[PDB]
Amino acid sequence: SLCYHNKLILAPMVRVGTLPMRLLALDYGADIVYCEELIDLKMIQCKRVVNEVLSTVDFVAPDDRVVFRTCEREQNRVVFQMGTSDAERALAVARLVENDVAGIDVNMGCPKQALLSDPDKIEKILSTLVKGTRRPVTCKIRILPSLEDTLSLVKRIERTGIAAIAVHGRKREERPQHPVSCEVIKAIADTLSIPVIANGGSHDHIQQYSDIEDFRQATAASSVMVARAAMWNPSIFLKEGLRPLEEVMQKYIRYAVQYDNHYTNTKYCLCQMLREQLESPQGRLLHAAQSSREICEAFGLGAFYEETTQELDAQQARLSAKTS
Ligand SMILES: Cc1cc2c(cc1C)N(C[C@H](O)[C@H](O)[C@H](O)COP(=O)(O)O)c1[nH]c(=O)[nH]c(=O)c1N2
């Protein structure tokens, strides 16, 4: 049901791509939102729990930590990314989450101790997945050192029946400071019979909404996935123009509290948004903050925090045995 053509996509990002960021990207016009990479070996340990208090579906590890949290609002739009090096374990993890997500993605940059380097194994993991789940299956790659090797590999990958491929147009051995190769992404999109999601354009190509469609045309790709630009301000997806960072940060913080996001993750994401402004008044208050309450107070959201905490407590009582 998920279509990968002509879309704006939030790229998978460790730490950044937890539920609050995903929901905020959807608010601002992203069509598809990837979660952070999560490890198959960790996910197989988790229990699926319907959390009626938060109105979420939680995947909860044996140490009681919530590894992945989702909700009905993103069900039709969220793509689950795993790091895997074992076909049958990947498939078990996909079946664990498949009823709560719209797509399953494999990060080819992830090791086998990169998967990208081993077409035999890629073909096995991806064909096992494609055959075994009712959701579309994608993968995400970095380009190889030679143009010709890159084109042969993607032809191999494509024959596994995946629905789309995201291509970060940088070689493994080069920083984000090196220019992105639109030439290569164009050659891949020209070659492949499946949609290609261009990636790697933030900063050097993508500073405002209209840069996204420009990058898509330069790459001749079907869609564009955005990571760093969205991490800095997820209203990058909004056709009408960027929103003021204060509005965005407050909206982020509200989601983080309403979905009981761990405060260290909330703080990490805010620090990425405030990257040029750690010395601003709010920057310094954030730095000192050691709890979600203190994060909220740093942004003028103390009354919001108290009220929401009371709401979530009252919801918990309402939904307990005693009320029955
Ligand atoms: C903080 C952070 C975290 C991650 C990443 C990046 C950043 C900045 N990236 C890579 C990312 O998806 C993307 O390919 C690159 O950042 C290039 O695209 P942009 O130019 O940033 O839009 C990444 N890639 C991936 O496949 N899975 C992941 O979970 C991560 N995590």
Numbering used by the authors: 7 to 119, 129 to 339
Question: What does the published report state?
Answer:
The reduction of uridine to dihydrouridine at specific positions in tRNA is catalysed by dihydrouridine synthase (Dus) enzymes. Bound FMN functions as a cofactor during the reduction of the C5—C6 double bond of uridine. Increased expression of human dihydrouridine synthase 2 (hDus2) has been linked to pulmonary carcinogenesis, while its knockdown decreased cancer cell line viability, suggesting that it may serve as a valuable target for therapeutic intervention.
Here, the X-ray crystal structure of a construct of hDus2 encompassing the catalytic and tRNA-recognition domains (residues 1–340) determined at 1.9 Å resolution is presented. It is shown that the structure can be determined automatically by phenix.mr_rosetta starting from a bacterial Dus enzyme with only 18% sequence identity and a significantly divergent structure. The overall fold of the human Dus2 is similar to that of bacterial enzymes, but has a larger recognition domain and a unique three-stranded antiparallel β-sheet insertion into the catalytic domain that packs next to the recognition domain, contributing to domain–domain interactions. The position of the recognition domain is stabilized by the three-stranded β-sheet insertion in the catalytic domain, which packs next to the recognition domain. Interactions between the extended C-terminal helix of the recognition domain and the three-stranded β-sheet of the catalytic domain that were not seen in bacterial Dus enzymes appear to extend the domain interface and may stabilize the overall structure. Density-modified SAD phases resulted in clear electron-density maps and autobuilding was able to produce an almost complete model. The FMN density was nonplanar, hence the two-electron-reduced form (PDB ligand ID FNR) was used during the refinement. Part of the positively charged and conserved area of hDus2 corresponds to the active site containing the bound FMN molecule. The corresponding segment of hDus2 (residues 118–128) is not defined in the electron-density maps. Conservation of the catalytic residues indicates that the enzymatic mechanism is essentially the same as for the bacterial homologues. We propose that structural differences and differences in the electrostatic surface may result in altered positioning of tRNA during catalysis compared with bacterial enzymes.
